Structure 1
Amino acid sequence: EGMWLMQQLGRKYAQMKERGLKMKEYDLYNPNGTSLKDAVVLFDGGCTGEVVSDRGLVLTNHHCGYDMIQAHSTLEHNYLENGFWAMREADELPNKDISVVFIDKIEDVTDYVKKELKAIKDPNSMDYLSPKYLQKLADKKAGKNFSAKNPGLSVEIKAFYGGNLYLMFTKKTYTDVRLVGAPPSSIGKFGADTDNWIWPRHTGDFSIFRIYADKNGNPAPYSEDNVPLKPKRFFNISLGGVQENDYAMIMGFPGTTHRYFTASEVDEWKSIDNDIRIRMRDIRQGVMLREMLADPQIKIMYSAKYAASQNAYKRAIGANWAIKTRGLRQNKQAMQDRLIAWGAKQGTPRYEEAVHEIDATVAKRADLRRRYWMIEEGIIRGIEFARSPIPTEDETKALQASARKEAIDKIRTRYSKFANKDYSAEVDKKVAVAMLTEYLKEIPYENLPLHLRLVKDRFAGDVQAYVDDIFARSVFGSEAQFDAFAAVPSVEKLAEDPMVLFASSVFDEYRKLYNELRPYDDPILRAQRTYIAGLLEMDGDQDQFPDANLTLRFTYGQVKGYSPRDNVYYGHQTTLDGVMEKEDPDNWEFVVDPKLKAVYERKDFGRYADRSGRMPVAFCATTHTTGGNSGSPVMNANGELIGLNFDRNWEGVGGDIQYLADYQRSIIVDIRYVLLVIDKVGGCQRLLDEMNIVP
């Protein structure tokens, strides 16, 4: 059920041992010595990775190394669709703007931070959560010249439990991380968008990198003279596999959770955040689908935007299903009622007062938050011409010297980015007409962005006429209209431009709403400090984990399937047979790599097939993961790598508020399938040879 601090391993070890953990406590996490924790990395600031060899070889997800695979892909060498397999270390490709972070040391600095905070004076100061304040405290504790005296190292203090616990992290950052291997996109992204958040899953979501360092193993930026890093710890790869009920554990960097949400925050998340996103994205996607189906060129241009909009749309449907069916609201209400009853018995009213504060803040910001999500989903992300060019003060105070020509070239560059190869003005007019019709129905005249008042005032409520007029009269309505403006540019024309007035107007309202809503975050945050303090003083930091905050956590559970609906069971493991079942050569998402199809046909599975002779692909577990856990190592009872976490099922997206024991599963790619692809698809024996594989 939790994403536990490394400090909490001692207090959990007995339960983990009872659940099947066989390895020694300090072999997994040692606060003053080398442990498995030392083989886990924060890959590129978002994902998780793991060192799997004495030469700094790193495994992470395909979707984690995707941008690096794309940056090295050309028409001649398409590594994104064909995969990449460096046959020698010298062929491994460097990547600009990449990093891996090791968590060298972690220390509890709560009493230190709390004593330093006593000098605040203002009781409403948000410095207790300030990265700038906490960094000044971190520097004070580590030393004046710490990073110079210890090169490659850095320190960081973070708040936990709403400001009730502080930890200082000593981090080692490496920035020369080279691409080593990757399967074709047909394996690394088999499900593509259709199987996103879906279990059963048949995706071989992996990519291989290598950490490079100076001659002494110290961090260094890219240099042709850099040598592979020899790390203090790396994972052994297990080929024993997984069985139903086997103990499994994960270490990674989960980003965010909302485990201490009040019932009023769950109602708000449902009725504002989720309902608006679901409603507006359904209108948007519905118009895009009609147009993509009727024009193959519109399908080419809008496919990525349609898919990108569907991602959080699906997430919201999954989250709303949990709120409706799993009693998320009720369990938060039972949590706060229990604390309020305990606080009454103790004579301490501050907990009930803190919950009341959160409820009152949520109730007070309701109309503003609704208006914010309405403009964000409806216009800011719903209508493409909302992001059309807005002339800067420097650009207008240049049009009215040959600085007119420089201003027009800056505006033209922005206009070409807006109206690009994938932009259709006709599709955008249709999307805007349906999105604005819904927006104008939900937001009243007095609350409208100033230009949208023209729908009622100038166009007699004709949204189609208003949108037609924007394009017919705007200098950004067509290339010919822009070139006619660029030939005779007047600031007066730009000041009255219907598209510029629309774009400026909707961005004014969006910022006015954001700035009005920001002050409401602080009272909730301060009240959460008292609320979480109350929950911990009552039931303890034992069965209630601190919210995820992009810091190193461990989670444990078992390899186990689940029943999604009545009379249906999804088992714990997928096989290569499921990939072949899903094959569709006329659907880009489900095309099967010919080399992999041949391996399956010839049953050339080597030492990677299971006891039944079937080739495993992926498995699922009752571990508690969220975003940030992509690429996380999955370990055996002995701490051996059995897979890489790459997703979680949709029935568990509400797991960031309330973990769902009977539905929530981590979707992991089986390490045996990883090695099978490296071996039989990539032919990269050198990678297999440098890993320590156990029978």
Structure 2
Amino acid sequence: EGMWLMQQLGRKYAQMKERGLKMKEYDLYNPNGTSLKDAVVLFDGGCTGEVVSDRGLVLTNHHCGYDMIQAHSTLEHNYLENGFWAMREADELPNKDISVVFIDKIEDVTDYVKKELKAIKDPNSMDYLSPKYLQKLADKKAGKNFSAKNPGLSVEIKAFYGGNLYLMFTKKTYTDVRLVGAPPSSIGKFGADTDNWIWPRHTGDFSIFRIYADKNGNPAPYSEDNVPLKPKRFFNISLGGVQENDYAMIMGFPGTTHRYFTASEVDEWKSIDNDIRIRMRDIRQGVMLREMLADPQIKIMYSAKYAASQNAYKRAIGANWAIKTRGLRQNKQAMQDRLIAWGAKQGTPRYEEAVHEIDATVAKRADLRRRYWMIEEGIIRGIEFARSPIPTEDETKALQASARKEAIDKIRTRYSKFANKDYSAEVDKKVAVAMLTEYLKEIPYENLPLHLRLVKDRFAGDVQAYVDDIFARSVFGSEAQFDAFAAVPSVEKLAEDPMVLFASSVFDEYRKLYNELRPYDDPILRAQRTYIAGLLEMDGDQDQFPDANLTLRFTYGQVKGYSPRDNVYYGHQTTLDGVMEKEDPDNWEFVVDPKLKAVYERKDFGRYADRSGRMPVAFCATTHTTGGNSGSPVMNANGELIGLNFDRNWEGVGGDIQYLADYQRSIIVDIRYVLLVIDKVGGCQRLLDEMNIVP
């Protein structure tokens, strides 16, 4: 059920041992010594990774190392499509802007932070959650020249439990992290977007990196003189596999959860956030799909934009399914009613006052939040010409010196980036007509961005005419229209341009709504500090975990499938046979790598197949994970690596608010499948040889 702090391992250890954990507590996490925790990294700011060799080899997801694989891909060596396998360490590719973070030490600094906070005076101060304020406290505690006396090391203080607990992290950051191996995208991204959030899953979602450092193992930026890192700890690879009900545990960096939402916040999340995102994205995607299916050239230009819109659309559908069917609202209502009854018995009304302040803030910001999501989903991300060029103050105060030619070159560069090889003005006019028709039906005239008032006032309610006019008269409506403006540029032409006025008008409303809504966050945050303090004082810190905040957490559960619906059971494990069942050579998402298909036909599974002779691919577990847990190590009862977490089923996405024991699962790529691909597909034996593989 939870995403536990490392400090909470002592308190959960007996429950974990009862659930099957065999390793000693301090071998998993030791606050004053080397432990398994030391082999876990924050990979490139938002993923998790793990050290799997004494030479700094790192495993993470294919989708986590995707940008690095793509940056090294060319028409001559397309690593994204064919995979990449460095046959020697010297052939491993450096990556600019990459990092791996080790959590060297973790310390509870609650009393220190709370004592420092007593000097505030203003009760409503938000310094208790300020990264700038907490960094000044972290620097004071670590010392004046800490990073100079301890190179590669840095300190950070974070708030937990709404500001009721503070931890200081000492981090070791390495920035020379090289690409070592990757399967082809047909394996690494087998499901592609069709299987995203889906279980059963048949994706070999892994990539391999290596941490490099100076001669002493200290962090150093890229240098040809850097040597592989010999770490304090690395994971042993298990080849024993998994069976149903086996104990499994994960360490990683879950980003965000909302476990302490009031019932009113669940209602708001459903009725505003999710319903607007679902309604607006379905309109956008519907027009886009019609156009992509009618023209193969439109499919090429819009495939990535369509897939990017679908990802959070599916998340919102899964989240709304949980609100509708798993009683999330009701369970938050029961959680807050229990605290209110306990507060009434203790003679302390502050918990009931805190829940009331959250409800009153939610109810007061309702119309504004609705207007914000409507413009963000409907226009800001819904219509491409909302992000068309807006001339700066510097650019107009140049057009009306020879700096007129420089202003036009800057505007031209932005026009060329908006109307790029993937932009269709015709598809965008169609999407805008459907999106604005919905937007104009939902947002009253007095609440519209100023330019949108022209639909009723100037165009007699004809949205199609309004959109046609924007393109017909705008300097960004076509290449010929821009070039005619660029030849004779007037600031009066730009100031009256229908597309400039639309873009300016919608961004002005988006910012005015953002600025008006920002003040409502603070009373809710302040009330949550009191609310969570009451919850913890009443039921304790065990069963109720602190919300995820991109910090190192552990979660434990079992390898177990689930029943998605009446008479249907999804087991705990998928096989290579499932990849072959899904093969469709004329659908790019489900093409099968010929070397992999041959391994399957010949049953060349070696030491990686299960006892039945079947090749496993992926498994699922009752661990509690979220975004940020991509690439996380999945451990055995003995702490040996059995897989990498890479996704979670859509039925469990409401698990960020309420864990769903009968539906929520972490989707994990089996480590045996990872090794079979490195071995029989990549032929990269040296990587197998440097890992410590246990029989």
Structure-1 separation of matches of 2:172 and 2:43: 12
- For residues 388-439 of structure 1, the C-alpha deviation after alignment (integer angstroms, 9 at most, x for no partner) is 0000000000000110000000000000000000000000000000100000
In 2: Cα distance, 1:294 partner to 1:213 partner: 53
CA–CA distance in 1 between the matches of 2:313 and 2:161?
30
Deviations 1:334-359 (A, max 9, x none): 00000000000000000000000000
Query: Residue 617 of structure 2 aligns with which residue?
Result: 617
In 2, the alpha carbon distance for the partners of 1:311 and 1:30 equals 38
Post-superposition offset of 1:669: 0.1
Q: Distance in 2 between matches of 1:354 and 1:670?
A: 46
State the shift of 1:634 in Å: 0.1
Post-superposition Cα deviations, 1:487-513, rounded to whole Å, max 9, x if no partner, equal 000000000000000000000000000
Query: Residue 572 of structure 1 corresponds to which residue in structure 2?
Result: 572
Distance, in Å, in 2 between the alignment partners of 1:97 and 1:91 is 19
Equivalent positions of 1:547-566 (< 5 A) are 547-566=547-566
Segments ≥4 residues shifted beyond 6 Å: none
Q: After superposition, what is the alpha-carbon deviation per residue over 1:134-156, rounded to whole angstroms, capped at 9, x for unaligned?
A: 00000000000000000000000
SS in 2 for 1:292: helix
Post-superposition shift, 1:560? Answer: 0.1
Q: CA deviation at 1:379?
A: 0.2
Deviations 1:13-69 (A, max 9, x none): 000000000000000000000000000000000000000000000000000000000
Q: CA deviation at 1:673?
A: 0.1
Residue 203 (structure 2) pairs with residue 223 (structure 1) = no
Q: 1:630 & 1:51 partners in 2: Cα distance?
A: 15
For 1:96-126, what per-residue CA distance to the aligned partner results, in whole angstroms no more than 9, with x for missing partners? 0000000000000000000000000000000
Matches of 1:261 and 1:662, distance apart in 2:
21
In the TM superposition, residue 183 of structure 1 has moved relative to its aligned partner by: 0.1
Structure 2: distance between partners of 1:24 and 1:586? 51
CA deviations on 1:267-295 (whole Å, 9 max, x unpaired) are 00000000000000011001001111111
1:344-381 Cα shifts (integer Å, max 9, x gaps): 00000000000000000000000000000000000000
CA deviation string 1:300-345 (max 9, x = no partner): 1111111111111110000000000000000000000000000000
CA distance, structure 2, for counterparts of residue 366 and residue 120 of structure 1: 32
- Inter-partner Cα distance in structure 1 for 2:199 and 2:133: 43
- Structure 1 unaligned runs (5+)? none
Tell me, what secondary structure is at the counterpart of 2:41? strand
2:309, 2:631 → 1: CA distance?
24
Q: Could you tell me which residue of structure 1 aligns to residue 123 of structure 2?
A: 123
| Residues 230-262 of structure 1, C-alpha deviations (whole Å, 9 max, x = no match) | 000000000000000000000000000000000
- What is the rounded CA distance, in whole Å, between the counterparts of 1:303 and 1:543 in structure 2? 43
Q: How many residues align?
A: 695
Cα distance between partner residues in 2 of 1:216 and 1:285: 53
Instruction: Tell me the alpha carbon deviations over residues 666-686 of structure 1, each in whole angstroms, 9 at most, x when there is no partner.
Output: 000000000000000000000
Alignment of 1:237-256 (within 5 A): 237-256=237-256
Q: Secondary structure at the match of 2:317?
A: helix
1:450 CA displacement? 0.2
CA distance in 2, matches of 1:310, 1:40: 31
Report what 2:429 is aligned to. Answer: 429
Q: For 2:31 and 2:251, how far apart are their aligned partners in 1?
A: 15
How far off its partner does 1:626 sit?
0.1
| CA–CA distance in structure 2, aligned partners of residues 35 and 315 of structure 1 | 35
Using the alignment, how far apart are the partners of 1:615 and 1:430 within structure 2? 48
Distance in structure 2 (CA, Å) of the matches to 1:11 and 1:596: 45
Aligned equivalents of 1:666, 1:433: Cα separation in 2: 40
What SS is found at the alignment partner of 2:357?
helix
Q: Please give the per-residue CA displacement for 1:158-211, whole angstroms capped at 9, x wherever unaligned.
A: 000000000000000000000000000000000000000000000000000000
Q: CA deviation at 1:84?
A: 0.1
Q: Using the alignment, how far apart are the partners of 2:109 and 2:576 within structure 1?
A: 49
SS at match of 1:291: helix
RMSD of equivalent CA atoms: 0.2
For residue 591 of structure 1, report the CA deviation from its aligned partner.
Answer: 0.1
Could you list the per-position Cα deviations for residues 199-231 of structure 1 after superposition, in whole angstroms to 9, with x for gaps in the alignment?
Answer: 000000000000000000000000000000000
Identical aligned pairs, as a percentage? 100
Whole-angstrom distance in 1 between the partners of 2:406 and 2:21: 67
SS at match of 1:365: helix
- Separation of aligned partners in 1, 2:227 and 2:301: 43
Distance 1:47 1:611 in 2: 33
Aligned-partner Cα distance in 2 for 1:215–1:304: 43
Distance 1:376 1:156 in 2: 33
SS of residue matched to 1:530:
helix
* Residues 471-490 of structure 1: CA deviation (Å, up to 9, x unaligned): 00000000000000000000
Aligned counterparts of 1:384 and 1:233: Cα–Cα separation in 2: 49
Map 1:374-385; keep pairs closer than 5 Å: 374-385=374-385
Query: Where in structure 2 are there 5+ consecutive unaligned residues?
Result: none
Q: Secondary structure at the match of 1:660?
A: coil
Q: Distance in 2 between matches of 1:161 and 1:253?
A: 16
The equivalent residue for 1:489 is 489
Counterpart-to-counterpart distance in 2, 1:308 and 1:42 = 24
- Counterpart of 1:643 in 2: which secondary structure? strand
- Rounded to whole Å, the distance in 2 between the matches of 1:235 and 1:496 is 64
Counterpart of 2:456 in structure 1 is 456
**Whole-Å Cα distance in 2 between the matches of residues 296 and 203 of structure 1?**
27
Aligned mates of 1:664, 1:125 — CA distance in 2: 38
Report the 3-state secondary structure (helix = DSSP H, G, I; strand = E; otherwise coil) of the residue aligned with 2:360: helix
> What CA distance in whole angstroms lies between the structure 2 residues aligned with 1:293 and 1:572?
36
Distance in 2, matches of 1:235 and 1:325, equals 40
Secondary structure in structure 2 of the residue aligned to 1:204? coil
Rounded to whole Å, the distance in 1 between the matches of 2:181 and 2:518 is: 44
Q: Secondary structure at the match of 2:565?
A: coil
Q: Distance in 2 between matches of 1:456 and 1:155?
A: 57
TM-score scaled by length of structure 2: 1.00
Tell me the equivalent position of 1:439.
439
